[PDB]
Amino acid sequence: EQWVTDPVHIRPIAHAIWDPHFGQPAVEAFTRGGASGPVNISTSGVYQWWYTIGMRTNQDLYVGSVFLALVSA
Amino acid sequence: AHIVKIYDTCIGCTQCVRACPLDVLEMVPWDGCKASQMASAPRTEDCVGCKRCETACPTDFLSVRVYLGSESTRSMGLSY
Amino acid sequence: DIAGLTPCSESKAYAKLEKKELKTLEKRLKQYEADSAPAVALKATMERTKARFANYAKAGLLCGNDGLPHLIADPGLALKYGHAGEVFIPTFGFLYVAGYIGYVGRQYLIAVKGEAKPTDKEIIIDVPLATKLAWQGAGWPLAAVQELQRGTLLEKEENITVSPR
Amino acid sequence: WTVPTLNPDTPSPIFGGSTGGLLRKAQTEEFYVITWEAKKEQIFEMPTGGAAIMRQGPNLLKFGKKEQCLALTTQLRNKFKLTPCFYRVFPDGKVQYLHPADGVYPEKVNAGRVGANQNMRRIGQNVNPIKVKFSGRMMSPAEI
Amino acid sequence: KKVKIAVDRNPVETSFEKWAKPGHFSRTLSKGPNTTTWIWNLHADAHDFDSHTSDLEEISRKVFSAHFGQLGIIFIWLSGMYFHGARFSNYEAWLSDPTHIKPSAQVVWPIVGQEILNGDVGGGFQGIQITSGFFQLWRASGITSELQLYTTAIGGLVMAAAMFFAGWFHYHKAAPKLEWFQNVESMLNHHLGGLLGLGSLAWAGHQIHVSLPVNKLLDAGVDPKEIPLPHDLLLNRAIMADLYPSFAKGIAPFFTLNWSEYSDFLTFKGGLNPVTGGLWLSDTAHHHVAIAVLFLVAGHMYRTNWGIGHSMKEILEAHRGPFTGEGHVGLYEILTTSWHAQLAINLALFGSLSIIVAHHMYAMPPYPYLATDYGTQLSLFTHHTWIGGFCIVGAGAHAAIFMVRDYDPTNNYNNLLDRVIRHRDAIISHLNWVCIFLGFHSFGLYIHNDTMSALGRPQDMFSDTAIQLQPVFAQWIQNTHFLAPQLTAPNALAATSLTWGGDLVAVGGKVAMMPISLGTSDFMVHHIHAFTIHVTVLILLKGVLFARSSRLIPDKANLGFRFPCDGPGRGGTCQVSAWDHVFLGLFWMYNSLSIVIFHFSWKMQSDVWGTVTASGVSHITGGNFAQSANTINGWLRDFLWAQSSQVIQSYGSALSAYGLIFLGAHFVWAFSLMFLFSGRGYWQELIESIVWAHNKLKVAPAIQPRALSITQGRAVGVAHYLLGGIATTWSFFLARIISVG
Amino acid sequence: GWVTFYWHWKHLTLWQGNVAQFDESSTYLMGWLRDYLWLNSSQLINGYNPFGMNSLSVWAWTFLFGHLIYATG
Amino acid sequence: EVGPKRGSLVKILRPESYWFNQVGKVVSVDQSGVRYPVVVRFENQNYAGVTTNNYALDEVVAA
Amino acid sequence: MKDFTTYLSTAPVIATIWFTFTAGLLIEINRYFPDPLVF
Numbered sequence A: 001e002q003w004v005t006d007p008v009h010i011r012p013i014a015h016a017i018w019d020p021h022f023g024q025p026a027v028e029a030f031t032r033g034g035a036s037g038p039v040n041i042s043t044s045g046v047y048q049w050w051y052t053i054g055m056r057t058n059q060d061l062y063v064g065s066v067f068l069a070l071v072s073a
Numbered sequence B: 001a002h003i004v005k006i007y008d009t010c011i012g013c014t015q016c017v018r019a020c021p022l023d024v025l026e027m028v029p030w031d032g033c034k035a036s037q038m039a040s041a042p043r044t045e046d047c048v049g050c051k052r053c054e055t056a057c058p059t060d061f062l063s064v065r066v067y068l069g070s071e072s073t074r075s076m077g078l079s080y
Numbered sequence C: 001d002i003a004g005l006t007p008c009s010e011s012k013a014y015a016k017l018e019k020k021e022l023k024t025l026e027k028r029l030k031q032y033e034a035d036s037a038p039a040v041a042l043k044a045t046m047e048r049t050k051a052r053f054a055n056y057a058k059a060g061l062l063c064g065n066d067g068l069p070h071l072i073a074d075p076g077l078a079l080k081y082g083h084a085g086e087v088f089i090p091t092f093g094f095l096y097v098a099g100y101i102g103y104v105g106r107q108y109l110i111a112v113k114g115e116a117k118p119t120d121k122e123i124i125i126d127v128p129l130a131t132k133l134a135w136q137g138a139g140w141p142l143a144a145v146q147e148l149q150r151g152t153l154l155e156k157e158e159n160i161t162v163s164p165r
Numbered sequence D: 001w002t003v004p005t006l007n008p009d010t011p012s013p014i015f016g017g018s019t020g021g022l023l024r025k026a027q028t029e030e031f032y033v034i035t036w037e038a039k040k041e042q043i044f045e046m047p048t049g050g051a052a053i054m055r056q057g058p059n060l061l062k063f064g065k066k067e068q069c070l071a072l073t074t075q076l077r078n079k080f081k082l083t084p085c086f087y088r089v090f091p092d093g094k095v096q097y098l099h100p101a102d103g104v105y106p107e108k109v110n111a112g113r114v115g116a117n118q119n120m121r122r123i124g125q126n127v128n129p130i131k132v133k134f135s136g137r138m139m140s141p142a143e144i
Numbered sequence E: 001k002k003v004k005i006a007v008d009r010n011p012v013e014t015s016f017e018k019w020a021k022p023g024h025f026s027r028t029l030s031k032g033p034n035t036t037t038w039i040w041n042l043h044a045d046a047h048d049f050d051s052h053t054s055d056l057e058e059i060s061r062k063v064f065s066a067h068f069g070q071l072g073i074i075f076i077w078l079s080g081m082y083f084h085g086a087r088f089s090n091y092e093a094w095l096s097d098p099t100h101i102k103p104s105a106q107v108v109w110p111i112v113g114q115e116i117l118n119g120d121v122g123g124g125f126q127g128i129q130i131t132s133g134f135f136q137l138w139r140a141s142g143i144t145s146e147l148q149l150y151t152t153a154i155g156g157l158v159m160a161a162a163m164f165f166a167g168w169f170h171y172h173k174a175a176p177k178l179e180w181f182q183n184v185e186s187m188l189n190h191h192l193g194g195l196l197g198l199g200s201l202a203w204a205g206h207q208i209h210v211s212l213p214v215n216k217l218l219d220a221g222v223d224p225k226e227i228p229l230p231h232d233l234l235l236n237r238a239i240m241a242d243l244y245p246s247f248a249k250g251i252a253p254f255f256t257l258n259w260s261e262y263s264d265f266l267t268f269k270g271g272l273n274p275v276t277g278g279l280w281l282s283d284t285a286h287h288h289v290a291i292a293v294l295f296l297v298a299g300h301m302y303r304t305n306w307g308i309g310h311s312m313k314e315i316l317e318a319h320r321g322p323f324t325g326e327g328h329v330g331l332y333e334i335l336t337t338s339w340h341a342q343l344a345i346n347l348a349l350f351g352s353l354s355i356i357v358a359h360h361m362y363a364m365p366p367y368p369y370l371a372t373d374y375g376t377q378l379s380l381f382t383h384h385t386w387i388g389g390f391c392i393v394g395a396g397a398h399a400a401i402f403m404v405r406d407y408d409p410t411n412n413y414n415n416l417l418d419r420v421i422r423h424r425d426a427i428i429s430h431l432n433w434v435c436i437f438l439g440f441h442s443f444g445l446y447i448h449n450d451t452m453s454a455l456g457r458p459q460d461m462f463s464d465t466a467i468q469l470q471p472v473f474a475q476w477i478q479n480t481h482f483l484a485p486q487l488t489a490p491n492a493l494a495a496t497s498l499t500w501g502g503d504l505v506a507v508g509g510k511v512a513m514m515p516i517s518l519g520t521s522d523f524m525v526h527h528i529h530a531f532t533i534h535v536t537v538l539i540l541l542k543g544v545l546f547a548r549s550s551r552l553i554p555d556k557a558n559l560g561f562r563f564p565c566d567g568p569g570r571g572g573t574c575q576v577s578a579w580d581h582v583f584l585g586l587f588w589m590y591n592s593l594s595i596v597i598f599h600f601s602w603k604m605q606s607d608v609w610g611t612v613t614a615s616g617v618s619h620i621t622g623g624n625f626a627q628s629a630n631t632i633n634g635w636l637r638d639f640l641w642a643q644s645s646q647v648i649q650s651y652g653s654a655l656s657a658y659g660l661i662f663l664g665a666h667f668v669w670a671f672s673l674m675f676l677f678s679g680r681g682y683w684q685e686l687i688e689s690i691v692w693a694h695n696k697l698k699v700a701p702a703i704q705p706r707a708l709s710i711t712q713g714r715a716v717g718v719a720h721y722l723l724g725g726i727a728t729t730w731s732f733f734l735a736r737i738i739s740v741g
Numbered sequence F: 001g002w003v004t005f006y007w008h009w010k011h012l013t014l015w016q017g018n019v020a021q022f023d024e025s026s027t028y029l030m031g032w033l034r035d036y037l038w039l040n041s042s043q044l045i046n047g048y049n050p051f052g053m054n055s056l057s058v059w060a061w062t063f064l065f066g067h068l069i070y071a072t073g
Numbered sequence G: 001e002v003g004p005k006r007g008s009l010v011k012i013l014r015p016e017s018y019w020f021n022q023v024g025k026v027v028s029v030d031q032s033g034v035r036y037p038v039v040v041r042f043e044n045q046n047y048a049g050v051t052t053n054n055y056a057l058d059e060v061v062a063a
Numbered sequence H: 001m002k003d004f005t006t007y008l009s010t011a012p013v014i015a016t017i018w019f020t021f022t023a024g025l026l027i028e029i030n031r032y033f034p035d036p037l038v039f
């Protein structure tokens, strides 16, 4: 929702990181991209593809995920 | 167990039987060669697949062939 | 000119590269005396550098944006813009020497093949026969073309071993 | 000719023992026993490592696999010119004579033997795998 | 029972008839070539003397002549080094300035642009900076001119011709019998007294009469042209008496047991020379005198032709305890009849001594201006270490060869060797377990450190700041060695080496030798070395003990020492021969020694070598070994990535060749992977397709082209792997140590 | 590996604004080894060091991880 | 008297043989009813190092 | 002398002499014609 407003100066986020092995420097080192915790910056390019085909809000991604999960089932 | 086969090109030179280290091959009477003998494999349950018999065969192509089959205790040569 | 390249005789990077090489050589030469062996060796290297750059610019080579020469591999472009000496003439030169060596070796093998023990003639080279064939191989393209026209260059299918398919 | 009977009260060659001896397989699955007749005392090499001394007369030894027994048989035949024979012994006490099968060594032809696993053709005359496909299990074109 | 000179006259006739008949030594190769494999066999069985014939006398005679030819080759090499130092070097200029002029003894011809390699090494010369240390060795012996080196080169050539003539004479004119070679008692007596003792005594005499006064004058500031010639010092007693007052008394104090009068050139100074940086030559001369006396005394131990002396068989048979059975019975007959067993023992002790030489030479530099030459120090340590490791692997190989060919169970009933073969399974199992334990406790520490550093937890690592593992034993031994000249060495002035502790010695602004401190990183790398050594020992010992038989193949001895496999049976018997164990031991030796030389280079460049500034000593890397060597990332970044900058940017300078080799060595090594990851069946079928192409154009050779054998493929792969890796490290070390050292 | 090395180096020199670096160092293997493999790995191996760590430490660990797996193979 | 003459040269027609489409010298022809009575010796050895083999009457063609 | 010539006619000796001659010819050509890049 924030990457679509500024797709030049905002890095995409893949998912959060929950690792009990991380110490304090690892937590603040991986905390980037405007998140509230340690996250991974994606390199797959799904942000640009989804933004180009029409996704604008997180609700669209949630609906697509639910639809694809039901199709997989 | 491994599959050991003897083909009709066997000249009965008895070299494959002597090279067998687990007593799998033997010589039986025959009428297709001058030596009147032919190699046989009646104890293939003990063959490990070392292919020493194939190395000792002088015919072109070989007369004795070994095909790796189901592995077992005797076929894997395990002392445990 | 060709592919946006400029001749080496009119390239600024080429002259700057030559000045860079001469500058580092002269800088290394300033630490020695005037009548010593390293000074004479450095002066000889500098003269070799000047002659090399002058010869490359004299040959009409095409340089790029890096100041280094470029070769023209297209036969049409080479024969049309005076670049046949880069890749065309050396190509035919290698073809002549390659077929020369190949024909000499083939003739030696076919000659020793009909003898009693060809393996001995292969590990122990028969210097007189090899020297005669080496001197006679100057007419290799003519002999090879005549062999191809007579049908004796190749072996028949029935005389060559193949796999059981 | 008669099948020999295993004599468990047979003296064994003087060996100090080694770590390449029998394992739990000798008590759980099977093992092998090699017996031979020696004309005189002689130091020989054990197939599992070490040098033992074969006694004069009967000699018995235990091995983990058939290859060890046949290797010792070949060593005794080619180095000292003897006639050894071995059996396969099971934990329940069953003894099965193995080599020589008919009392005659397999290198020489002997009457009464029947050739098995013999193909009355050559290798180049075998069928293609497509003909032996879709069988009960993985079957090679030479198995038929 | 009598030790004499047994010989045979004209056994073999000197002729060229056999030179035209390749493969005449073996009965299998005497037929001639039929396939390309034969050619490879011609080179594989060339020196295999116990395979040509079963006669021990013929093998011994061939060995003797081979030794003479080898010494002739070595003399040609030494004469070449002396000639290069006499005509294509700057030794005369280096003598006048051994702290600024770089040693060089090789010039290149001005062809195809290679003249750039003739770098300005100093002293008005242009060449290639050498790292063999010949300049320092010649300075230590008192050589002050090119004429002396030229004369030494001529003498070396004469000695080479004499060695070759000796080999020819002992093989075709006077060949000793087998009983002459089996006189191990007389041989040991002579090699102990004559060879070692007389060589040490002769070198002591040269050092006392030439090295000591010439080097003393060189260290006194005298110009090399004004120093008296060695014969001048050897002819009159005035000059020697002036330089050493004890010489005014002649040899009288030696015979009157007044050796204390010679306390001016035979001392225990210890430490290093503050002017040159190397060991005191007076101490080395005293050392050689003591060594000569000790070896001469030891040379009268075994009985030869008189009653006095020992019989090695008697001593071996007298050593027998309750836990070993019979003992060393039959060992004397084993070593007096098998050349492979003696080769195994000699190669093992020789390689071990070579590694010891490398350690003792970097720690106690004996040559003047040697410690200040970091390039020579690093290259010498690395070279001697590699030679020692290769010789050790060869020792294991020959032990396996003896176990396969020369072993006889009829003479090893209840001795030590038989009991070892009896419990070989226990030996291998315990060594395997200790290898696994060492691997876990050695590599897991580095992996744990990498993980904790990457996870942002530096306090959970294994370092000096975090959990520390200090080598208390080594530190205590260092302290004991430092305090030795005050309690346990009252007659010694300083310590044996400066690495134990105390004040550092620097020459020409460069640190010659300073104390070495061990921490957590040193502890970890030492455990890594121990683990790698244990694994190499495991592979070699497994190939030696299980060479005759095993639980998988009971008749391995019948298959020989070098065979590819026993077939795909029993699940697969690939690499069961002892040769394959040597093949794997080569890789492990390469890995072990590579880590050893990396640790040596990093520790020396980080905590020992470096310039001397005003109130402080700055090292090459800044002392980052105690903080960055506890992680693999530190080794890869600070030691491999940072230190390789010199070898990759060497293009355009005198070290560009190294960079080229640095690339070339990466090729050969990767080339090895083609022969190690594949098999000859694929190559044979590919060769068949190529043969079809040849047959079509009637260009198929009569010698049928066959792919390399399995054993040959493994040997080619390991050879290329070793050459590529060793050459890569050689280029990296030399380029780096020459650029910043 | 060769095609991806070529793609990465050409695009890196294009994005950095200096295509002449690739054009002048892509003709000799020393340029590929120093100007591409050695020059672009300085930040990668610096993900974690005794001075601390940053968000690039996971890639350094993955780098060494891949090297270890390769050597194990 | 049946089969090729002793000492002549024949071509091997057996596809699985190493000497397929190759010339070999005839050594001896067995006079019994064996399947492979012709004995052919070749100058070039196979991968096993053998230079002689036994072929059938129709497996060899005069060449 | 016949045996010596036969030994000199072997593959390694002939290869050594031939490669030495070829290398010497190429080296002398580059020496008298420095830096030849084109024809």
Ligand code: CLA
Residues within 6 Å of the ligand: C074, C075, C076, C077, C078, C080
């Ligand atoms: C090995 C593959 C190969 C390749 C990829 C090329 C590629 C090329 N060649 Mg060519 N050529 C080759 C082999 C090859 N050649 C060989 C073996 C010969 C010896 C017979 C020639 C002799 C040759 C000549 C004489 C010419 C080219 C030319 C050309 C260029 C354009 C013509 C074309 O594409 O048609 C394929 C080329 C041919 C079939 C050869 C005949 C020439 C055709 C008919 C083009 C001539 C029309 C005209 C001059 C085109 C120029 C238009 C404009 C720029 C003025 C082109 C880059 C032309 C050129 O650019 O001049 C500098 C040119 O005139 N080549």
Ligand code: CLA
Residues within 6 Å of the ligand: C101, C102, C103, C104, C105, C106, C108, C109, C125, C130, E689, E690, E691, E693, E694, E697, E699
């Ligand atoms: C009489 C020598 C001779 C001749 C005429 C040929 C001819 C040929 N080879 Mg061949 N080859 C030779 C020797 C020779 N080869 C040798 C000694 C080797 C072992 C290194 C090979 C290995 C080889 C391979 C692996 C392949 C060929 C292939 C080919 C074909 C493609 C052209 C080519 O240049 O390939 C390349 C040629 C080489 C790599 C080797 C050249 C070595 C020298 C220059 C040849 C002469 C050396 C000899 C010592 C000189 C004779 C001495 C005598 C006068 C006393 C071609 C018909 C290819 C093929 O399969 O066919 C399509 C192929 O893949 N060759």
Ligand code: CLA
Residues within 6 Å of the ligand: E012, E013, E014, E015, E016, E017, E018, E019, E025, E061, E062, E063, E065, E066, E068, E069, E070, E073, E164, E165, E166, E167, E168, E171
């Ligand atoms: C010119 C004098 C001469 C002559 C005519 C002979 C002749 C003969 N010698 Mg003899 N020999 C000589 C000198 C001579 N030798 C010397 C000086 C030595 C001491 C090294 C020996 C030691 C010796 C032994 C131990 C044996 C012979 C044997 C033989 C017989 C056959 C072997 C052979 O010659 O193949 C030719 C061999 C070669 C050409 C190889 C020579 C390699 C030399 C020695 C070292 C080369 C080092 C090399 C430069 C370094 C490699 C690096 C590489 C990159 C170049 C043969 C009749 C053998 C025999 O009688 O068969 C049972 C035997 O075993 N010789």
Ligand code: CLA
Residues within 6 Å of the ligand: E063, E064, E067, E068, E071, E180, E181, E183, E184, E186, E187, E190, E191, E193, E194, E195
């Ligand atoms: C004091 C007597 C003496 C001395 C000095 C030597 C010295 C040597 N022996 Mg020897 N040996 C001796 C007695 C001696 N031996 C006796 C009594 C026997 C019989 C039991 C043997 C049996 C023997 C064998 C079987 C072998 C040696 C070998 C060697 C050489 C080992 C190479 C080396 O690493 O050393 C250092 C190398 C050098 C110092 C090079 C310089 C060589 C000088 C000239 C010393 C030679 C001295 C020696 C006595 C010859 C002089 C006699 C005269 C007729 C020329 C070495 C030169 C090996 C060999 O053959 O090498 C060729 C070897 O295989 N020796």
Ligand code: CLA
Residues within 6 Å of the ligand: E201, E202, E204, E205, E206, E208, E233, E234, E235, E236, E237, E240, E246, E247, E249, E250, E251, E254, E289
């Ligand atoms: C093997 C080692 C070695 C050798 C070769 C020498 C050799 C020498 N030392 Mg010396 N030295 C040594 C070790 C050695 N040293 C050691 C280890 C020490 C420390 C303890 C010393 C300490 C020392 C001192 C303090 C002195 C010497 C001195 C000398 C020189 C005279 C010796 C002497 O006093 O008269 C001894 C007499 C003899 C050796 C007899 C020589 C026998 C000749 C060669 C016989 C020739 C006969 C022949 C058949 C003639 C026919 C020829 C024909 C053409 C006519 C001499 C050249 C003296 C010196 O140089 O003064 C400055 C001296 O003062 N040395």
Ligand code: CLA
Residues within 6 Å of the ligand: E043, E044, E045, E046, E047, E048, E049, E343, E347, E390, E391, E392, E393, E394, E395, E397, E401, E561, E562, E579, E582, E583, E586, E719
């Ligand atoms: C005192 C040292 C010594 C001696 C006398 C021997 C003697 C012997 N060894 Mg041995 N060995 C040694 C050390 C020694 N070795 C070492 C240090 C190693 C560890 C590498 C080995 C490992 C070893 C193995 C694995 C085997 C032997 C074998 C043999 C026997 C046959 C000779 C042979 O190798 O074939 C001929 C020798 C050669 C063909 C030389 C090979 C040349 C190499 C590959 C080139 C080296 C590269 C070079 C340094 C760089 C050149 C650069 C290039 C660009 C030109 C022979 C009795 C073989 C055996 O047991 O026989 C059955 C055997 O298989 N050795």
Ligand code: CLA
Residues within 6 Å of the ligand: E431, E432, E433, E435, E436, E437, E438, E439, E440, E443, E444, E447, E535, E538, E539, E584, E587, E588, F068, F071, F072, F073
């Ligand atoms: C980097 C690659 C690599 C690695 C990791 C190993 C590892 C090993 N080798 Mg080996 N080797 C290699 C390359 C390698 N080798 C190559 C290229 C060759 C060909 C020359 C050989 C040839 C060779 C031989 C001939 C032998 C070995 C042996 C051994 C074992 C020694 C025991 C030990 O070190 O204890 C500890 C184990 C290690 C250090 C391996 C890494 C373990 C990691 C650090 C622990 C991580 C645990 C982690 C928490 C697991 C959680 C998993 C999670 C997903 C659930 C060991 C497992 C010897 C042996 O069999 O054992 C005695 C043996 O003789 N190797």
Ligand code: CLA
Residues within 6 Å of the ligand: A021, E440, E441, E442, E443, E444, E445, E447, E448, E451, E452, E460
């Ligand atoms: C093999 C080398 C090695 C060693 C010595 C250590 C050691 C340690 N690690 Mg570590 N680790 C390693 C490898 C190693 N690690 C590797 C390769 C990785 C990467 C996968 C990690 C990843 C890792 C993480 C993520 C963490 C550690 C942590 C720790 C610490 C606590 C672990 C613990 O409490 O477990 C408990 C251990 C046991 C229950 C058994 C101990 C073994 C006993 C003492 C041996 C008993 C045998 C005895 C001699 C038998 C006697 C015989 C009979 C007479 C009785 C500890 C000091 C933690 C840490 O950071 O601490 C601050 C932690 O968070 N490690």
